């Protein structure tokens, strides 16, 4: 599945992501862009058995369980499958722990690179939230 900038922005908001840990919606919608471009099935093998899943590219070592990853901690208490879906409940909430782990959104390199410091507002501009 692929979400529309607003479609996603809506869901993200409907599952308390706005300002969470001080991060405003703009940041989570942009985050999803340069990460999966709103594509639920965007997987990515890593030279470390880890595989990043979902819109937000959540790793399978610490936060997710897929079976095939050695050193698994499953902190989000969730099977990776859940990050590949028509809804972001599992992805939104499971992202809440990640952003709550130290350095903010810098957990998402694409965000640090294409979003840290811009006027994220643009990304929700037109979306009736």
């Amino acid at each position, epitope marked *: 599945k692929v979400f529309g900038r607003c479609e996603l922005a809506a869901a993200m908001k409907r599952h*308390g*992501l706005d300002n969470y840990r001080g991060y405003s919606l703009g940041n989570w919608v942009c985050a999803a862009k340069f990460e999966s471009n709103f594509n639920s099935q965007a997987t990515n093998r890593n030279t470390d058995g880890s595989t990043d899943y979902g819109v937000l590219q959540i790793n399978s070592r610490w936060w997710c369980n897929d079976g095939r990853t050695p050193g698994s*901690r499953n*902190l989000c208490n969730i099977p990776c499958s859940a990050l590949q879906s028509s809804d972001i409940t599992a992805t939104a909430n499971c992202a*809440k722990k990640i952003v*709550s782990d*130290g350095n903010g959104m810098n957990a998402w390199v694409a965000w640090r690179k294409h979003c840290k410091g811009t006027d994220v507002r643009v990304w929700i501009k037109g979306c009736r939230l």
Partner: antibody
Amino acid sequence: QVQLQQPGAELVKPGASVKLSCKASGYTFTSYWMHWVKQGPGQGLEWIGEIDPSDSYPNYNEKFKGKATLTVDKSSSTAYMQLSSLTSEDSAVYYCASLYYYGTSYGVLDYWGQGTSVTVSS
Amino acid sequence: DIQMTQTTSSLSASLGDRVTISCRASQDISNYLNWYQKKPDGTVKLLIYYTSRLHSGVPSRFSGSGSGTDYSLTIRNLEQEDIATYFCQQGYTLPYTFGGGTKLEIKR
């Protein structure tokens, strides 16, 4: 400045249910996860649950999946644990706590509550 | 779940001796070990996080160590409020599991 108030005692008849309550203050309620540990009589502490206030998202301990039911109320800044069908064995001191200052990967609960000693008796 | 065992349920020594509380987990939880003090008062307080990092506020007396399956809290000069029970918990994964405790007592 991070304060989980919590009612000290709570008498409960068996077969009934009690809704314990933990009220926060000193930080932004919804932006932090709430934790609850039980202390069985003459035993260790048992991690029973987790809940995110913002999207009201519980994270259970397989064991208690059915006894405890996490819930929260934002307008009041208060987490609630509801012990369903209370029984003899399930009488003890129940703590609410938080994951605040430390990185989620450390699982370090810090800033705990005082306690609620539920006593099941008819 | 991960079994957190503390072999000695009560330990005694005198106000000025060093005390060493043990804690051994089932699998390598890679330094994700925390120590909590439960005073007879009822309140619980964080003393050390991540094996040896003193939580802010604790007296340098408390010392943390270990790494792997074995860990331990070591109080240097046992004192007044130190007489309580000590728990260890793991952070490595869900569900979180804490040790059964170790109750200190003044040796007579």
